[PDB]
């Protein structure tokens, strides 16, 4: 078969996972098999090929035949289309029959093949069906494990209606905050496989192919290809597939693995401090725009640059550089989201931070923009102002525009009503102003 | 019926021999038809160059009287989304040609307005049914076409119409309409054409309407300038001389008098002064940089409106300040 299917781990010691991560998964899973467990769903999130299900299966192999009140998992198959069932009801009938997999029929239900969540209605049905499992009144329920692979959704659906699920396939955009911040849900984020474990497993696979490796005069150059694959990728499946493709080859075809997408804070750090791989800013910016145009085009990135450019040296650079950066960002904001705007703003920020960059600079920590907090406080201000307006319409027949409200009605009007009451709203609209 | 038509539609070419200006493209497509092997074509050029007139005449030459059932013409006036490509174009290409003229022709006019999903889906319809159907893509902007679609199409560029072709078509129009045109009027029409036959025909129709008697009267340059509302070649030179030589009061008076003489706008004067200053032997390399940059901002501000007198004074001051560098 394929080397990632024939050289699959047989026990937990052969799984490419960190020791601490394995310990936290093991203890959490063991706790979820108790009669009345505090955690009902275990949400495993991370990149592709991180042994997320490759650890769940081999842990179930030793966990399920320990608590079965006298051996494997029950995985949801989304592609199953039965005769008399709506497509959106396929997961409901799976969760309604999976809840019977309890004592004397115990089985860890694993949901790796998620239902179609790019369609809004079935995504909402999935969310409310998970909420109906977290808030279930059943005295005993089987352990539920949901594996979600964090992958960036590529540029498609040219409509401007791109939602979060249209940008990144992550647990945040599939689940809601009620599920994600539930007392009975445990989240264990997974990290890409480190170079040491990848090297060890690719060397075990090589000593299991030593005969064929030596016959094709490829056994002394195995160290360099394992090192290159370990340094280039963090995907175990992609690493083994590339190793198999290189071994079964008989030529000088170059080693090429899959491509990974950077993070939002990773891209911010690349724009600010530069990349260690290349000292050419033009090449780095061009590759960042080529591979990650879905993130460099969103306005929140240009906002994050303005929010985090002060972390270069904890805020101890020249004011002229900061003025140039913010002026360039303001000028880019007037280009109506053209491709030439981001490619100029990021280039100017990188050029500004390159010249002032000196050795020994103790940089700061970047953060996400607070624009959303301001936008929600604006909506709260709107709600309170409309409450002021409608409560000030029948008691005292008067119409006033919201622009006049945000200037003189919210400081003066409470200062009159509360002063008339110190002897009908009486508080400042939108809360007090600070600093 | 055809005499109650606008001149831009009445004088549409019906055969490939009536398409002027584009000699290399026509002498290639005619041999392509003569050999009988027509590849997938791409016609590119400015508006009013003769791309649609070429492709319709070519299809008429190939198909004769069977143009109705053998040619599918889809343009921007019809929906051409992913479903349209996957159904209408695909069933037109897949079905047989009733053994009429060998291969089918699909003309995609104004394909630059087509969405990228449709242009990407059309790539495996162009190269799969190429034995029975051929695609012709007409576009004015090549940046809106996917690179693969450009790759699977033979690109023919329609150049702006040369002066000789404009003169040859004007002669036919004058013969048909029994009109007389002075050589200076023809020169004015060709310089204002900017390589467009539609503009030539539209201006000629208005010039014929302007004449009190369509016959026994010749359309002079004055008639053309009055009809199209363009400054005369002397007014532009007078304004430029007043700006470059006279003081700030006399130049301001001369510009306003020239503009109020015939209700001349500022944008055409700006373009004329730009064209006249283009062939000027500047010797500082900053006079040109300042002139072009200031006149472009004035031209952009005029496009959004504003105070006209302030813009005219801005033009005068920009020219005067840019020519301060030269001396």
């Amino acid at each position: 078969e394929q080397w990632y299917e024939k050289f699959k781990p047989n026990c937990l010691e052969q799984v490419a996972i960190h020791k601490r991560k394995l310990k936290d998964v093991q203890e959490a899973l063991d706790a979820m098999f108790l009669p009345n467990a505090k955690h009902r769903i275990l949400l495993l999130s991370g990149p592709s090929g991180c042994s997320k299900s490759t650890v769940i299966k081999e842990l179930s192999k030793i966990l399920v035949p320990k608590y079965r009140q006298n051996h494997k998992v029950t995985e949801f198959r989304g592609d199953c289309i039965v005769n008399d069932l709506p497509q959106m009801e396929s997961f409901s009938e799976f969760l309604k029959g999976a809840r019977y997999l309890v004592m004397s029929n115990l089985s860890l239900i694993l949901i790796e093949d998620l239902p179609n969540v790019f369609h809004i209605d079935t995504r909402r049905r999935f969310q409310q069906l998970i909420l109906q499992w977290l808030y279930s009144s059943e005295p005993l329920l089987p352990p539920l494990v949901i594996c979600i692979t964090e992958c960036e959704i590529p540029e498609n659906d040219n409509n401007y209606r791109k939602f979060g699920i249209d940008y990144t396939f992550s647990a945040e955009t599939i689940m809601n905050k009620e599920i994600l911040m539930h007392p009975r849900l445990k989240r264990i984020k997974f990290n890409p496989i480190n170079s040491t474990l990848l090297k060890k497993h690719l060397k075990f696979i090589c000593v299991q192919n030593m005969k064929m490796l030596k016959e094709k005069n490829k056994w002394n150059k195995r160290q360099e290809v394992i090192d290159y694959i370990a340094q280039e990728t963090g995907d175990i499946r992609s690493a083994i597939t590339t190793l198999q493709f290189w071994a079964t080859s008989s030529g000088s075809l170059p080693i090429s693995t899959r491509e990974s997408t950077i993070s939002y804070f990773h891209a911010i750090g690349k724009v600010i401090h530069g990349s260690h791989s290349t000292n050419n800013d033009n090449e780095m910016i061009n590759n960042l725009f080529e591979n990650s145009n879905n993130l460099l085009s969103k306005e929140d990135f240009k906002l994050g640059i303005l929010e985090n450019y002060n972390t270069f040296n904890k805020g101890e650079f020249s004011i002229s550089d900061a003025s140039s950066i913010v002026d360039c960002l303001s000028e880019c904001d007037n280009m109506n989201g053209l491709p030439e705007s981001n490619e100029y703003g990021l280039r100017e920020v990188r050029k500004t931070f390159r010249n002032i960059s000196k050795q020994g600079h103790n940089h700061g920590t970047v953060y996400f923009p607070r624009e959303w907090k301001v936008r929600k406080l604006q909506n709260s201000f709107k709600v309170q102002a409309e409450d002021w307006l409608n409560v000030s319409l029948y008691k005292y027949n008067a119409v006033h525009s919201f622009r006049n409200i945000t200037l003189e009605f919210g400081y003066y009007a409470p200062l009159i009503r509360k002063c008339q009451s110190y002897k009908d709203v009486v508080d400042r609209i939108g809360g007090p102003i600070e600093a | 019926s055809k005499e109650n038509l606008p001149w831009v539609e009445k004088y549409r070419p019906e055969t490939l021999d009536e398409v002027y200006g584009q000699n290399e493209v026509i002498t290639t497509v005619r041999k392509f038809v003569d050999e009988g092997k027509l590849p997938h074509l791409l016609f590119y050029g400015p508006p009013g160059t003769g791309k649609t007139s070429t492709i319709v005449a070519l299809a008429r030459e190939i198909y004769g009287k069977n143009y109705s059932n053998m040619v599918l013409e889809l343009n921007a006036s019809d929906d051409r989304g992913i479903d349209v490509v996957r159904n209408q174009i695909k069933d037109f290409a897949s079905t047989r040609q009733i053994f009429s003229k060998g291969f089918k022709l699909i003309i995609l006019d104004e394909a630059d307005a087509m969405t990228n999903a449709a242009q990407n889906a059309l790539r495996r319809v162009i190269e799969r049914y190429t034995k029975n159907t051929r695609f012709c893509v007409l576009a004015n902007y090549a940046h809106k076409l996917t690179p693969a679609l450009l790759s699977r199409c033979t690109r023919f560029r329609f150049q702006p119409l040369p002066q000789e072709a404009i003169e040859r078509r004007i002669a036919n129009v004058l013969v048909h309409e029994k009109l007389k045109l002075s050589p200076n009027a023809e020169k004015a029409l060709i310089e204002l054409s900017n390589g467009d036959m539609r503009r030539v025909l539209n201006v000629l129709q208005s010039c014929k309407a302007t004449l009190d008697n369509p016959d026994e009267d010749e359309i002079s340059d004055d008639v053309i300038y009055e009809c199209c509302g363009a400054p005369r070649p002397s007014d532009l030179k007078a304004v430029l001389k007043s700006i470059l030589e006279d003081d700030w009061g006399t130049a301001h008076y001369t510009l306003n008098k020239v503009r109020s003489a015939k209700g001349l706008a500022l944008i055409d004067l700006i373009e004329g002064i730009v064209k006249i200053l283009e062939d000027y032997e500047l010797q500082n390399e900053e006079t040109r940089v300042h002139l072009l940059t200031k006149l472009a901002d004035i031209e952009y501000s005029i496009s959004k409106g504003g105070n006209d007198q302030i813009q005219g004074s801005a033009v005068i001051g920009a020219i005067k300040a840019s020519f301060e560098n030269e001396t």
Binding site: - | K2, E3, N4, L5, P6, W7, V8, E9, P46, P47, G48, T52, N75, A76, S77, D78, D79, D109, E110, A113, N140, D196, R198, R199, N202, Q205, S206, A209, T210, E226, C227, C228, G229, W248, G249, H252, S260, G263, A265, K294, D297, I298, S301, S303, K304, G305, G306, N307, D308, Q309, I310, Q311, S313, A314, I316, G317, A318, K320, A321, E324
Partner: protein
């Protein structure tokens, strides 16, 4: 009865003044039947809408107008679907049979007219979906595009449409039309008036007619039987009085930032429009003989920049203060 701008709207093509290069061409199409696709562009209030409304009437008559005319403006949706369905189906429609009265009184051309007024507000895709609609059905349907900015019309559509530029209506070509309206309404004005009205209304007859109507509504309210003077016209047009402008230029000549800032602060309270005081300063500074070539060259660009910033919808106080400070340091 009605506002004078609507009462004196041109009913026929002979009432459209100062635009003969286009009306002469349009009148010839009454005898012929070769009306082309038309693009009416020019300054606001020049008579583009009135000309097409008069041409439509003179071509069809009030009875055939309802069947042979489709008018779409910015007051209705003109998206890609509207252009590809409603306009295309109206162009594909068959020319209705003229009545015997219509054929015996009106020319009744064998085509209909689609009038797309305020075409500058249409998107580039709705305009792209119109090119083959006008070309294919040109023998049965004609198109009239009316706009103020010809740059907002795409080049493919502008090539297919005959361009008719409507000239700005100044005191040299609209004085007879204004005098006619003054005479029919029995408006008494001093000599020089009805020219100051057309000078204040830069290339706009609608604003001048409204200004004259407003002057008359005060003249017959005063009830003294006296002629309207240019001072009242300037007062009710928003023109800054010359004493205030002289004070502005005297404060500018001193060059002290604080006094100019205080004067601008007390001037913005009077409610004067920035585009008017900037325009008046332009006339004061450009035509004056006490300034050198360099000063005029610099201030021309300063006024151009100020006007361009003001046209974008910016704060008048900041722009006016910056302009006066820049002139004070020239």
């Amino acid at each position: 009865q009605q506002p004078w701008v609507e009462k004196y709207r041109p009913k026929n093509l002979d009432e459209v003044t100062a635009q003969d290069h286009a009306v002469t061409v349009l009148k010839k199409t009454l005898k012929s039947a070769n009306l082309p696709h038309m693009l009416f562009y020019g300054p606001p209030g020049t008579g583009k809408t009135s000309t097409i409304l008069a041409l439509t009437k003179e071509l069809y008559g009030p009875d055939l107008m309802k069947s042979r005319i489709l008018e779409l403006n910015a007051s209705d949706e003109r998206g890609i679907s509207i252009v590809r369905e409603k306009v295309k189906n109206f162009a594909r429609l068959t020319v209705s049979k003229p009545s015997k009265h219509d054929l015996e009184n009106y020319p009744c051309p064998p085509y209909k007219i689609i009038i797309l007024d305020e075409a500058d507000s249409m998107t580039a895709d709705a305009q792209s979906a119109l090119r083959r609609t006008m070309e294919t059905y040109s023998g049965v349907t004609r198109f009239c595009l009316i706009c103020n900015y010809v740059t907002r019309i795409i080049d493919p559509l502008a090539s297919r449409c005959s361009k008719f530029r409507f000239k700005a209506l100044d005191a040299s070509n609209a004085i007879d039309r204004l005098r006619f309206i003054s005479e029919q309404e029995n408006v008494k004005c001093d000599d020089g008036v009805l020219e100051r009205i057309l000078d204040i209304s830069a290339g706009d007859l609608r604003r001048g007619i409204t200004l004259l109507q407003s002057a008359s509504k005060g003249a017959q309210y005063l009830g003294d039987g006296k002629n309207i003077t240019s001072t009242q016209v300037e007062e009710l047009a928003g023109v800054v009085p010359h004493d205030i402008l002289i004070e502005i230029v005297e404060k500018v000549k001193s060059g002290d930032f604080d006094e100019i800032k205080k004067y601008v602060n007390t001037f913005m309270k009077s409610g004067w429009s920035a585009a008017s005081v900037v325009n008046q300063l332009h006339e004061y500074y450009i035509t004056n003989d006490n300034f050198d070539t360099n000063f005029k060259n610099q201030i021309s660009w300063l006024l151009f920049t100020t006007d361009s910033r003001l046209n974008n919808g910016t704060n008048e106080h900041i722009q006016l203060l910056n302009l006066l400070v820049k002139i004070s340091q020239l």
